[PDB]
Description:
The complex is a heterodimer of chains A (153) and B (119). Chain A is mainly beta. Chain A folds into two domains: 2-95, no CATH class; 96-153, no CATH class. Chain A has one helix and twelve strands. Chain A has a seven-stranded antiparallel beta sheet with strand order 2-1-3-4-5-6-7, with no helix packed on it. In chain A, a hairpin with a 2-residue loop joins strand 8 and strand 9. Chain B has 119 residues and is mostly beta strands. In chain B, the strands form two sheets. Chain B has a four-stranded antiparallel beta sheet, with no helix packed on it. A three-stranded antiparallel beta sheet of chain B has the order 2-4-7. Chain B starts with 8 loop residues before the first strand and ends with a strand. Chain B has one domain (1-119). The longest helix of chain B has 8 residues, at 25-32. The chains are: A mainly beta (153), B mainly beta (119). The A-B interface holds A 7, 9-10, 15, 21-22, 24-25, 29-34, 53, 55, 68, 75-76, 109-114, 123, 125, 131-134, 136, 152-153 and B 1, 24-37, 39-41, 60, 63, 65, 69, 101, 103-105, 109, 112-113, 115. It is classed as antimicrobial protein.
Amino acid sequence: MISDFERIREDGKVIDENMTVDQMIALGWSPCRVVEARWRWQEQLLSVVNSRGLLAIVVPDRQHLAILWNDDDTGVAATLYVVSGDRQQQIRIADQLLINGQLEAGIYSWFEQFPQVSPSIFTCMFSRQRDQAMFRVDIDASTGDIVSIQHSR
Amino acid sequence: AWLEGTQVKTEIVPPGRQYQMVVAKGQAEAIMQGKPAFGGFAAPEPIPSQAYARDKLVILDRFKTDVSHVITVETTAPQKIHSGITGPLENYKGGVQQVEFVGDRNLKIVGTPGVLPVE
């Protein structure tokens, strides 16, 4: 299982798991990119590092991470990956989605958590490229496959 | 989302124009982690409470479970918007000005997220 999950900001400050936004503000922190996510699996410390920035969550099954990986210097372009807890395998999640019969390019933008029937499901918010409409995309980390897409606002 | 029988304008606003934007829990977490996690809707006037975000801005629970934070966004280049009055949806009344960002989202956050009081 995934333990001791820590996100390290470019300025070195460490975000503990489930540290809240209000706790960060109360410490006097400004927004800052996260350049490393680190965690324990069995007897190993594992990490992913991106100097361009990344957004990482532990999937509630505690055996996958969802990693939104910045692809350039802007913080916008990004690719979503599901990484196994032992960090040995990963899957790139599709960001060209069939929406109303049309193949739609877009960009994964941030994570949210909704009630789910399985802890293996996480949610990533998807910005459709052609009109920036937001879609909630639920993904089963145990298979690496999209479960459902719903228009959001 | 818009009030029936009212005009929804399409505008281009200059850089430096600021709006208030309600952000959900994971959205605010991404913002605190340096991501431009901007939604499509904002407000030209202050957003005083979560009750206001729900009833007046008609931000539905199904879309944003948590509306406990607000950010200030500022346009960084000319920005296309829709402008008009919120319409009622579910058991919410609407009735205040909102803007919708059209096309490219040329925004940046100003400061850090603020806390919205429940009431």
